[PDB]
Amino acid sequence: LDKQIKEIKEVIELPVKHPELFEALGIAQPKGVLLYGPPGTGKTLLARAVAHHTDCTFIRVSGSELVQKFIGEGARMVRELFVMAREHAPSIIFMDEIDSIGSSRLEGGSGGDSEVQRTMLELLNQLDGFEATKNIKVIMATNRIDILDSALLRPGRIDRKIEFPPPNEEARLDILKIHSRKMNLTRGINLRKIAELMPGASG
Amino acid sequence: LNAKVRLLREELQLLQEQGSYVGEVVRAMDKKKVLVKVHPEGKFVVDVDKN
Amino acid sequence: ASKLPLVTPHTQCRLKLLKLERIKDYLLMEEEFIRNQEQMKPLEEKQEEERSKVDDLRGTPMSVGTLEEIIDDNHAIVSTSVGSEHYVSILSFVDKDLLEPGCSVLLNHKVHAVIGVLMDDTDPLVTVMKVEKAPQETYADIGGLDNQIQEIKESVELPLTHPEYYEEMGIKPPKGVILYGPPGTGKTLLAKAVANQTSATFLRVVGSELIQKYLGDGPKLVRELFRVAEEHAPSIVFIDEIDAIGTKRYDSNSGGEREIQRTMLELLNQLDGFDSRGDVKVIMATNRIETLDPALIRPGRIDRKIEFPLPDEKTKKRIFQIHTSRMTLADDVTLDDLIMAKDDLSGADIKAICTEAGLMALRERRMKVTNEDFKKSKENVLYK
């Protein structure tokens, strides 16, 4: 996942350490990244890793009611979490979309229409020029971008999109070598054949 | 040794006196007065010791 | 303490001088009168003796309580923090003018008598929807429109800055303004410019959060919003994407589609109820105006309707001029070729193309921008 690492570094790490480098070209610093791909291909760990290396307080919201008591007493709105974000200025907000959301009916198509989507719509509408403090970023992880509503696909809203294709032979072999280190192995495994015996899988 | 014995003897009388509550401070006010909250009761407006 | 506002001479005229001299003489004589008693019959310090007596009267702890009902002859029913309530009296040093139902009051520890009244502690909401600082630069950044800018200025700025033109002809300024048009053409941008220029308190709220998850919460939120907007000052209320409440439906909503109707009726009342409105201006904006209720837009609630059309090629050139003002642009590029890259591109595509080209040049650790960067940027942003 080296190319994805480079692409996310250009829009996360750079506009914190060297803002003047972006001011030299006189363009606004990006604030929106969207990651898309099949489930289990390594999106959430990547967001966690980049937030770890840049030293940013990694915050994520799932809209549950257990944690609500920490955000506020009633929290009629949803923007109230900014009251807690700006105290840890270099912060990142993460949001995840459920694996099953259709367009016909049932999940996604019927019942509800967005949930996570309306949350990012509100958040981006906030920090589009009305926000004073800087160094706040937003990320999602969804599959099948074609189902996103049109209000979120406007050319000026999302700054970057990144795709996570299912691994090929080399990626499967590397993941296997990474994850077999935790076990007591034996001299000579020839796990190349093991990788070649698994096809069209996930990481 | 005499000092430690005297202290041990006085400990019994010292320990008999009353306890003290624990609270959470909301925000301060004028002239050395603050506002505090004790969890199973309502909030109080209290004064501050000289130290 | 607002002794005399009639200083309209505002010059070295003998009238103002004589008025000031007489004011000084009156003040000196009253000072002598109010000092003589402290020099002849003090009977107490009266600077700290009374304060010491008052502090002695009230105990060192004092608890907070909620008023529920007050009788004129200095007593009331106060609910303690636990909930049991009493029939205590009222002292005289409590300045009985802030006595209102629901305000936290300071009661004595022993007899629970009302000794003081307490100021409140803001609200969580106010911070959520109070704009603090002006976002960015004023109308000089817009370009292209130049026509409805004067209309907005007539509605919001002119009634406040020069409230003399209207009084000569005796009219009330137009009340409501709504902005409609295709997406991505510069409505929120005009709102930002007004927010930067203006001097009143600016309140912003999106339409997608007017719908709640319980019963009867929506009308409550609307009422609280206009109460906050009313109780401060001359202010501006900005509501964005109203149609979002009539287009998308959420399963998290406890009711069905009728609670949306209840929220709508509440909003209509708040815009044109029979209470005295006061001094509040409303700005609304949407891109699907053929769906919302025509009873919400009748004259007397919304008086001005402004359409934002697609940009023309002159405005396209002006926008490209604006958005590459501080870019180290090479001499090879030409904007004319980019003008008709797409037949009906809007304002946002220009900024998208410029920023993406800048990023692509940033990758190669460069400073200038060449043609092939723009050529690839347009394909990256437009053709998916």
Ligand SMILES: Nc1ncnc2c1ncn2[C@@H]1O[C@H](COP(=O)(O)OP(=O)(O)OP(=O)(O)O)[C@@H](O)[C@H]1O
């Ligand atoms: N007339 C214009 N002059 C200058 N910039 C413009 C103009 N129209 C669009 N833009 C650019 O496009 C961006 C999009 O603006 P904005 O989102 O406020 O538009 P909008 O049409 O009100 O949006 P929406 O309908 O999606 O709420 C602006 O921030 C600006 O960069």
Ligand SMILES: Nc1ncnc2c1ncn2[C@@H]1O[C@H](COP(=O)(O)OP(=O)(O)O)[C@@H](O)[C@H]1O
């Ligand atoms: N590219 C990868 N390399 C190594 N391990 C991976 C990779 N992708 C996934 N994993 C492992 O598989 C798990 C998949 O979970 P995750 O990647 O968070 O799913 P998703 O990204 O779809 O939310 C991770 O916890 C990680 O331990």
Ligand SMILES: [Mg+2]
């Ligand atoms: Mg808008």
